[PDB]
Amino acid sequence: GSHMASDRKTEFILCVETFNEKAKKGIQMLIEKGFIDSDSNRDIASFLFLNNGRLNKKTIGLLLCDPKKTSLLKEFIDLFDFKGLRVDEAIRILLTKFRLPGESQQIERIVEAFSSKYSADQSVQPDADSVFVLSYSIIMLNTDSHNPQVKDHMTFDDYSNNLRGCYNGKDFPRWYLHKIYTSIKVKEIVMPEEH
Amino acid sequence: MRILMVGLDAAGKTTILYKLKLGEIVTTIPTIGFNVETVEYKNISFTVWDVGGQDKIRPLWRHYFQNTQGLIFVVDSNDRERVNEAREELMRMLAEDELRDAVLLVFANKQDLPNAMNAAEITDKLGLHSLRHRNWYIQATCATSGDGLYEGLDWLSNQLRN
Ligand SMILES: Nc1nc2c(ncn2[C@@H]2O[C@H](COP(=O)(O)OP(=O)(O)O)[C@@H](O)[C@H]2O)c(=O)[nH]1
Ligand SMILES: C[C@H]1CCC/C=C/[C@@H]2C[C@H](O)C[C@H]2[C@H](O)/C=C/C(=O)O1
Ligand SMILES: [Mg+2]
Numbered sequence: 001g002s003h004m005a006s007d008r009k010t011e012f013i014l015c016v017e018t019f020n021e022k023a024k025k026g027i028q029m030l031i032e033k034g035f036i037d038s039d040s041n042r043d044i045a046s047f048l049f050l051n052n053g054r055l056n057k058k059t060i061g062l063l064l065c066d067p068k069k070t071s072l073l074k075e076f077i078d079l080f081d082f083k084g085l086r087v088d089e090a091i092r093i094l095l096t097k098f099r100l101p102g103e104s105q106q107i108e109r110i111v112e113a114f115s116s117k118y119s120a121d122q123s124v125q126p127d128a129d130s131v132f133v134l135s136y137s138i139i140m141l142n143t144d145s146h147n148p149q150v151k152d153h154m155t156f157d158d159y160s161n162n163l164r165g166c167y168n169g170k171d172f173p174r175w176y177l178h179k180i181y182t183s184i185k186v187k188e189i190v191m192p193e194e195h
Numbered sequence: 196m197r198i199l200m201v202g203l204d205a206a207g208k209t210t211i212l213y214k215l216k217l218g219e220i221v222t223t224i225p226t227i228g229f230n231v232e233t234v235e236y237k238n239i240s241f242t243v244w245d246v247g248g249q250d251k252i253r254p255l256w257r258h259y260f261q262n263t264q265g266l267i268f269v270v271d272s273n274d275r276e277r278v279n280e281a282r283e284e285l286m287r288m289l290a291e292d293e294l295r296d297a298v299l300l301v302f303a304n305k306q307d308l309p310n311a312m313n314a315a316e317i318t319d320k321l322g323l324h325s326l327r328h329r330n331w332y333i334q335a336t337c338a339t340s341g342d343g344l345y346e347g348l349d350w351l352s353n354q355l356r357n
Contacts, residue, residue, distance in 0.1 A: 107229060129251060140229065142228045143226055150231060151233075151240060161257075162255055166254055
């Protein structure tokens, strides 16, 4: 009894290490050891959202962008509240809870789920599609701007021209796009714990 | 000078850039965002470009398609079931107004495999002979060993230079 607590924590830690290496196995272990009520998307999303700071963030991202994990991703992103935040501010919050994957297809799913959620959270007024393009363009800019492998960085005008016609058929106001651009340009999106 | 390298998934784009790399293995923290696979060879910059992805995002490709002198199309010579899919992707890339004068290099990759279609057959399956205004070359290769990679890049270089 005087060891129950300490033993319980160790049980938890071993589950996490198992999750970090193999998401599915770790989750099964966590549900079996009673750390997660069930295997529903809702219970798993809540666990990931709340214990984010104890799990391997890259593993979380690879779990969430798994094409068969559509609902888990939707449930997870539903735990955020983006009301009244601008697109780049909301994306930074989203990306503090997991490590964004690197393949375009994986990034697309994340941005898709994020966009529809961000849009619904608002009910410059971009429709669902415009928020998607804009958000996708932000991930692009972060890579273009800080990935050492990139040779020639977009200038604001490049970023701006590239988005022509993406605002409900027309253009986003220049001051708006400049704010977003400068935001990413001067403050790279990174995982704080990593530095 | 810029060159984009496209191809269906698993054609061997990553493998090819691995061999061409040789450079100091990434010992830095990965930048949040898209994977960037690029390399320099004879002052020419080659970059892998994923053509996958819903049409909604294509407008964001415009900036990167500007100033493109050449396209390298990588195709898995052993994947007979998806060869026609590959032809469609190539034809969609060549139709890009921004690549109208681009020089084309096709790497018929995975020639090391037993039942890999040869360069001649690939040339036929991809309809290369139907292209009425296009400078192109097809090179048999094996990305894992490096065979043909340089022979093809050297042909491409010589074509953009003069
Ligand atoms: N036999 C053989 N396998 C290859 C060759 N090039 C690539 N592969 C393999 O094909 C798979 C996909 O290659 P990859 O470069 O990742 O494809 P990408 O999706 O176009 O980046 C990997 O398992 C490679 O090792 C080749 O020339 N011969
Ligand atoms: C030059 C750098 C810029 C980074 C931003 C580009 C993102 C592209 C968007 C595309 O749909 C996937 C990417 C496409 O794969 C781009 C690869 C690449 O290395 O791009
Ligand atoms: Mg690859």
